[PDB]
Amino acid sequence: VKPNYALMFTLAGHTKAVSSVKFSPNGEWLASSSADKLIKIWGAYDGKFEKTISGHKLGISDVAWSSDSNLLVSASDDKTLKIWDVSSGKCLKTLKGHSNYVFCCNFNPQSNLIVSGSFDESVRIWDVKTGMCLKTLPAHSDPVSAVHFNRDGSLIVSSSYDGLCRIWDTASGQCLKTLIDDDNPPVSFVKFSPNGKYILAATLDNDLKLWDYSKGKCLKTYTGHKNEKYCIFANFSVTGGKWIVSGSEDNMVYIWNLQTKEIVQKLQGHTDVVISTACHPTENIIASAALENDKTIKLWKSDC
């Protein structure tokens, strides 16, 4: 098996490089954030523009959905994160505390908490209801590239340019594990596997790795793409065959066989670094977005 993703649509609208694309949990929406300071909502199946949500003062590096597809959180260079009511498009709260760019964000499964990572080298945990910061973790010694809750919310994983990936206990904020990748190259992205037993990390040495964090063992490696400059999102595609999906600095989307580590398909079309990709929660659909010379978003569909 090799998926056969083909272009569905090209979503244009952003005036600057797109930074992140995410599918809502119920699967009917695609939310995008851009260096143009805007967030746009699109129809996941028709690729139809739905609305623009604005408010941030500077570019936005990331956006995440709440478990009920009703809320959206964004991380911006203006040093804040913003919680948005998706249907009205208005800003419910502005999370303040970070002393530099906020680079990444995510709701926990319960969606009562928000975790953020910033260039200030800290990871903060916020209360969604009040917009207050509950904890500030002295997580790394360099910018934090990614933050992610595991499936039960008890854990948080963070990656950093300091070359480390750390597992944190959500309730206490204490570090449970620090992982080293021998040469310790900058970690540009990390995320738990759907079942929560693994961690997929991207390092700026053109390499992706699946780790059993508990054992500190590398089970698989995915290479062949180009990644030594930007923090490119990576995904687990489990709707059909089990694949590993990721953007690449050579303008293509890479799809690997998760078990054999074999490249099963490269999607062509974008005209600049594919900085972000997302996998639809129920259908074999992929959303990809590129930088400045492209600024478009593409929806791909496969029989898988």
């Binding site: 590096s61 760019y101 400045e292």
Partner: peptide, 5 residues
């Protein structure tokens, strides 16, 4: 700013 290196 993820869009910048």
């Amino acid at each position: 700013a993820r869009t910048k290196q």
